[PDB]
Design a binder for this molecule. Structure first.
Ligand code: ACO
Ligand code: ADP
Ligand code: BTN
Ligand code: MG
Ligand code: ZN
Lengths: 316, 284, 77, 449, 57
């Protein structure tokens, strides 16, 4: 299901599908499929550049929410192996809006923590649209401590609309849990790398994003507040979300100059959704490179550097 | 005309003898089973996949590699002093269980190796007076933890008990703290301690070291909790939720990491420990 | 009325042990929860429980007489 | 001789085994399902036992109930036949250990040869030629998988080593769908036969199905009877099978037979089984072993004069082979033609009642089945209701009789595959003899405007 | 601003590990980032009566 501005790409795709049927549909129909396929694929490839060259911040947000995209499960599958999912906070529940586990990266063992919006409606409602109740963040703290204890690096993916705004979420110390998370992660003796795949932000995202390095795709928005919220509070409306997106600076290159993120991982054309494997390979390369130049530093120097980088936050 | 016959009955005199110990049953589903098949599928009814009891020594052998097994704390035996006078005499039950099960106490410890990686394992023989955590149980637990500490190697255990050994009164209860102290001494070192819960895991054992290891792996449809369902039923005087204290339920309620079926167990432990200890992955 | 039938194949025994009282006997009625007979198969002496509470009108089999699947055993009126 | 045995099967093979038993004076016990109460072989048997409800899994595969019957009646062996529990090695193990005799091979060879890939490996070790392919179960090394595919040569076929009944096989046209095709084939194998093992084997485009029958007592004796040829198939399911096969000169007959006999000796094979093959340009490439009594067993019985079931029941009684390799002779030619309850075209089973029925009879015509008037075909198992034969002194005579017998035959109440049999018989190429397996598949044709 | 939460958390950790207590007394309103950063993090969390404390408005 392509977005509104990806229409010319769609109709060309719509002609492309029935090519399979015409191959063996009925009445002996087996036409010269290869010629038409090649011409239509050429046109489609040419047109996507005609479509994805002129997208800006409001679009970037739409693309960051494309309802066909790799979630943390997808990146785990397409760049990680021997994945073991640990579920359980030890207190009140395991949460489906966060998925964590311990896996191997090119032999090396790692910890993977991140969100999972679910693909279709069913897995979206079963995972609460990637909105974690605090018990999830307590689980994430528990896993992060486990990873710290056994001299293990931590790889974290961040793809959350935000911490759930609900009765159950507020009752259980949402603020307290996120505060603790932000406290412990800033003392681990192991390197930390955190991407911004997909749509993330709204503070709750930061619960698992305080690390040595930070990386973001080219169509991923990292906003202290969703554009619609900023629009409602400030613009006194919702339709004016694109203006809020333009003003805030939620796009990766805008953030990059702000010394906030350490690298942008380029996407396959038309969005990572068109070539999830290519995006997974790019992410794996970026993660490995980040880990490499990180392992040289010792644990004490690692923590000191982490603290120093934090203090660089804010123009002050 | 054979098309219309008499539907005669069978003659009772005919008599064939099948060996007694070659066919077993699974009360969970009712399908009779071939004992050697069940015993080869790690005591798992292949029909309904319902886990059953396994012998402690059999479990340790199943996990550990062959020829590297080394039992620990074999000289520790019950030395009742409370002379507990129940309907039976506690010495009576002690001796009866010891002879019936062939083991001194509920817990057995056997240092070994997993895919070439040193490890220490143990398990509970629930048949032994409900597998209660007697003084010897905690002493062997301490022995195993000490072995793991002296020789750098993950320590693993399996939980099966109905509660602490009542007949020893407060002597058993105190063991929980001893086990907790040993487990803390090891966790601070960096040696993982994975405890795999098996039905039944209840009362003192559940709240002492069953729930304390880095990971808490609950085998399916296993009964895990603190207070027995009868006690809770009488207290709340109501209907408990379906799946109460079930691993498929205590993974829903956050207390349980991952549900592992018995056949994978050895690989599942081997892969996870080879990861955590940071060792190269095991070869299938 | 109703007829309860063996759901498996095996030797038919009514007394659980070689010298034992029959689980049930003609006359005395049974309830839903009660063992009616023993159908031995591979030395695993199984048991059969009724499903409809009523009088034991008669027993259509005899101890030591093999029975087959769905073999009628007792008719409850 | 075996004092009594249980026919752990149903139907044509059940009735045939019952005839063989009564011939050899071995009392019979018929284990039936509740729907198969009024089968022929059931009614003609000494003692009838019901083991379960209509479905296959509840009743006929209920190994516990079958062993129950066998123990209560006092048997000292069991005949599984073909289908149901034919190749279930675990069934063989249980029957062996329970205290009874498993009529057929020892379970060990059931396990070794029921895994297609291990079977092919042992065959290679024993000198039997094999098709190019993986030479091992397929792993997840896609690089190695495609390297092997390139080495053998496209196109290729994925076959589940634990699959059966001509299902769970898919043809791969290229690497584009190799991964997905493999995954779905493994999924189907898991769903149906509970086994995931898949392997890659070369694809041949011009095969002529062959299979050579062998009898071995398991005591160092293994003989090879006449050949066979099941060329005609629909959905890889045989319909017509001629025995021997046209153009198999006695030189090739004896050449491959000696190797197959040596293979049976090496495996220490016990019971009756058949080494399938594939033929082209004067070559043989082993593809499987049906370690049981096949369905087209007659077409070797009428040309060799030896009753296979009796040979099995003798081996099970411990008697070594009573027939030497030299004394076995093939005198003539045969043909067989299965009758099935499917729609003649749609190939949808059409179970029902048979209002009217009339056997062929006549010289050289053999009618194996259980059907009869008033017999309501149960919509619960395979669709075969008769293995008809026509033995001739040459292929022309045998076809002629077949045509005449099919003319005579009447089966009314349920549609059946008689029209198709007549049409195949009239086919010119078939009458010549020597078509490739696809022949019937290609005649099917394709779309029309 | 969002990033400052981590800076404050790091400083508070640096102090708690020393042994110097950090008492944070919540007053209405305590919401959003401040609540979840250091409002709820001190050794004690003293909420003045009838004060509005939480995360989401
Ligand atoms: C307070 C404590 O820690 S001990 C209190 C007892 N335990 C509990 O309250 C927790 C669970 N309660 C139970 O009754 C069981 O453990 C359950 C719920 C798991 C049921 O498991 P069951 O299959 O019924 O096992 P069961 O209780 O019969 O145990 C088998 C044997 O162990 C004995 N046993 C079990 N736990 C204990 C114990 N803590 N002390 C002494 N004997 C015990 C039982 O008396 C029984 O002996 P018996 O068969 O010779 O009469
Ligand atoms: N390697 C192959 N090349 C071509 N055809 C094959 C091959 N393997 C099997 N077949 C076709 O499938 C039929 C059945 O194969 P087989 O392995 O005997 O499977 P099944 O166990 O289902 O009978 C063969 O008679 C043949 O026509
Ligand atoms: C084993 O010896 C097969 C025969 C069954 C023996 C058992 S003892 C219990 C039952 N009573 C009886 O008369 N026979 C049965
Ligand atoms: Mg075959
Ligand atoms: Zn079962």
């Amino acid at each position: 299901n392509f977005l509104d501005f990806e229409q010319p790409i769609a109709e060309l795709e719509a002609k492309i599908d029935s090519l399979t049927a015409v191959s063996r549909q009925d009445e002996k129909l087996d036409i010269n499929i290869d010629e038409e396929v090649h011409r239509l694929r050429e046109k489609s490839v040419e047109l996507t550049r005609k479509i994805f060259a002129d997208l800006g911040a409001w679009q970037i947000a739409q693309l960051a929410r494309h309802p066909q995209r790799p979630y943390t499960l997808d990146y785990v599958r397409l760049a990680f192996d021997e994945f073991d999912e640990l579920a359980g906070d030890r207190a009140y529940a395991d949460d489906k809006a966060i998925v964590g586990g311990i896996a191997r990266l090119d032999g090396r063992p790692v910890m993977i923590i991140g969100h999972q919006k679910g693909r279709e409606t069913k897995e979206k409602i079963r995972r609460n649209f990637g909105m974690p109740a605090p018990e999830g963040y307590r689980k994430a703290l528990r896993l992060m401590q486990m990873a710290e204890r056994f001299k293990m690096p931590i790889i974290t993916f961040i793809d959350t609309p935000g911490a759930y705004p609900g009765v159950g979420a507020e009752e259980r110390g949402q603020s307290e849990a996120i505060a603790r998370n932000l406290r412990e992660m800033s003392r681990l003796g192991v390197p930390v790398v955190c991407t911004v795949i997909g749509e993330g932000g709204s503070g709750g995202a930061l619960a698992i994003g305080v690390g040595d390095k930070v990386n973001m795709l080219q169509y991923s928005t990292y906003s202290v507040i969703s554009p619609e919220g900023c629009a409602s509070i400030l613009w006194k409306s919702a339709d004016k979300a694109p203006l809020a997106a333009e003003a805030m600076g939620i796009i990766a290159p805008r953030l990059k100059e702000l010394k906030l993120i350490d690298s942008i991982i380029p996407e396959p054309l038309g969005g990572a959704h068109r070539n999830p494997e290519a995006m997974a390979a790019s992410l794996k390369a970026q993660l490995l490179a980040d880990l490499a130049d990180l392992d040289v530093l010792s644990t004490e120097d690692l923590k000191n550097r982490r603290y120093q980088r934090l203090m660089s936050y804010g123009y002050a | 005309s054979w098309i219309e016959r008499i539907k005669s009955n069978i003659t009772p005199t005919r008599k064939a003898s099948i060996p007694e110990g070659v066919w077993t049953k699974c009360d969970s589903c009712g399908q009779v089973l071939y004992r050697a098949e069940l015993e080869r599928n790690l005591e798992v009814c292949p029909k309904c996949d319902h886990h059953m009891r396994m012998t402690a020594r059999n479990r340790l052998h199943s996990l550990l590699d062959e020829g590297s097994l080394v039992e620990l704390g074999s000289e520790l035996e019950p030395k009742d002093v409370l002379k507990f006078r129940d309907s039976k005499k506690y010495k009576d039950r002690l001796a009866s269980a010891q002879k019936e099960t062939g083991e001194k106490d509920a817990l057995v410890v056997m240092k070994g190796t997993l895919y070439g990686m040193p490890v220490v394992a143990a398990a509970f023989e629930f048949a032994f007076m409900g597998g209660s955590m007697g003084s010897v149980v905690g002493a062997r637990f301490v022995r195993a933890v000490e072995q793991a500490l002296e020789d750098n190697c993950p320590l693993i255990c399996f939980s099966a008990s109905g509660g602490a050994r009542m007949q020893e009164a407060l002597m058993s209860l105190m063991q929980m703290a001893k086990t907790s102290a040993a487990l803390a001494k090891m966790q601070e070192r960096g040696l993982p301690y994975i405890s795999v819960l098996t039905d039944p895991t209840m009362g003192g054992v559940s709240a002492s070291f069953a729930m304390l290891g880095d990971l808490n792996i609950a085998e399916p449809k296993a009964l895990i909790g603190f207070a027995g369902p009868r006690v809770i039923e009488q207290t709340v005087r109501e209907k408990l939720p379906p799946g109460f204290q079930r691993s498929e339920f205590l993974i829903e309620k956050g207390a349980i990491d991952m549900i592992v079926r018995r056949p994978e167990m050895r690989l599942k432990l081997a892969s996870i420990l080879a990861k955590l200890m940071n060792l190269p992955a095991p070869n299938p | 009325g109703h007829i309860v039938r063996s759901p498996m194949v095996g030797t038919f025994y009514r007394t659980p042990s070689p010298d034992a009282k029959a689980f049930i006997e003609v006359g005395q009625k049974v309830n839903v929860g009660d063992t009616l007979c023993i159908v031995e198969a591979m030395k695993m002496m199984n048991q059969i429980e009724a499903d409809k509470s009523g009088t034991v009108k008669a027993i259509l089999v005899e101890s030591g007489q093999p029975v087959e699947f769905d073999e009628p055993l007792v008719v409850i009126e | 001789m075996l004092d009594k045995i249980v026919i752990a099967n149903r139907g044509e093979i059940a009735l045939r085994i019952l005839r063989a038993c009564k011939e050899l004076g071995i009392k019979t016990v018929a284990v039936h399902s509740s729907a198969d109460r009024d089968l022929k072989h059931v009614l003609l048997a000494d003692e009838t036992v019901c083991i379960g409800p209509a479905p296959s899994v509840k009743s006929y595969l209920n190994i516990p109930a079958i062993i129950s019957a066998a123990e209560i009646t006092g048997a000292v062996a069991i005949h599984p036949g073909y289908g149901f529990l034919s190749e279930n090695a675990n069934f063989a193990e249980q029957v062996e250990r329970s205290g009874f005799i498993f009529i057929g091979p020892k379970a060990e060879t059931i396990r070794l040869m029921g895994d297609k890939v291990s079977a092919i490996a042992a065959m290679k070790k024993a000198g039997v030629p094999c098709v190019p392919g993986s030479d091992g179960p397929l792993g997840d090394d896609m690089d190695k998988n495609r390297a092997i595919a390139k080495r053998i040569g496209y196109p290729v076929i994925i076959k589940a080593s634990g699959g059966g009944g001509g299902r769970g096989m898919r043809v791969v046209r290229g690497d584009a769908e190799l991964a997905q095709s493999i995954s779905m084939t493994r999924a189907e194998a898991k769903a149906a036969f509970s086994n995931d093992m898949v392997y890659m084997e070369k694809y041949l485009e011009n095969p002529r199905h062959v299979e050579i029958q062998v009898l071995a007592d398991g005591q160092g004796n293994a003989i090879y009877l006449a050949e066979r040829d099941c060329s005609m198939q629909r959905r890889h399911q045989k319909v017509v099978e001629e025995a021997p096969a046209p153009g198999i000169t006695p030189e090739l007959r004896r050449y491959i037979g000696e190797r197959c006999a040596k293979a049976c000796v090496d495996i220490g094979y016990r019971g009756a089984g058949t080494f399938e093959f594939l033929f082209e340009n004067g070559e043989f490439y082993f593809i499987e072993m049906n370690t049981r009594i096949q369905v087209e067993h007659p077409v070797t019985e009428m040309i060799t004069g030896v009753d296979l079931i009796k040979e099995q029941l003798r081996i099970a009684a411990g008697q070594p082979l009573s027939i030497k390799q030299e004394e076995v002779h093939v005198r003539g030619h045969a043909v067989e033609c299965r009758i099935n309850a499917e729609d003649p075209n749609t190939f949808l089973p059409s179970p029902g009642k048979i209002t009217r029925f009339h056997a062929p009879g006549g010289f050289g015509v053999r009618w194996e089945s259980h059907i009869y008037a008033g017999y309501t075909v149960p919509p619960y198992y395979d669709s075969m209701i008769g293995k008809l034969i026509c033995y001739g002194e040459n292929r022309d005579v045998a076809i002629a009789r077949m045509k005449n017998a099919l003319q005579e035959l009447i089966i009314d109440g349920i549609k059946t595959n008689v029209d198709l049999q007549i049409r195949i018989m009239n086919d010119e190429n078939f009458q010549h003899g020597g078509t490739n397996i696809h022949y019937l598949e290609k005649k099917l044709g394709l779309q029309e405007k």
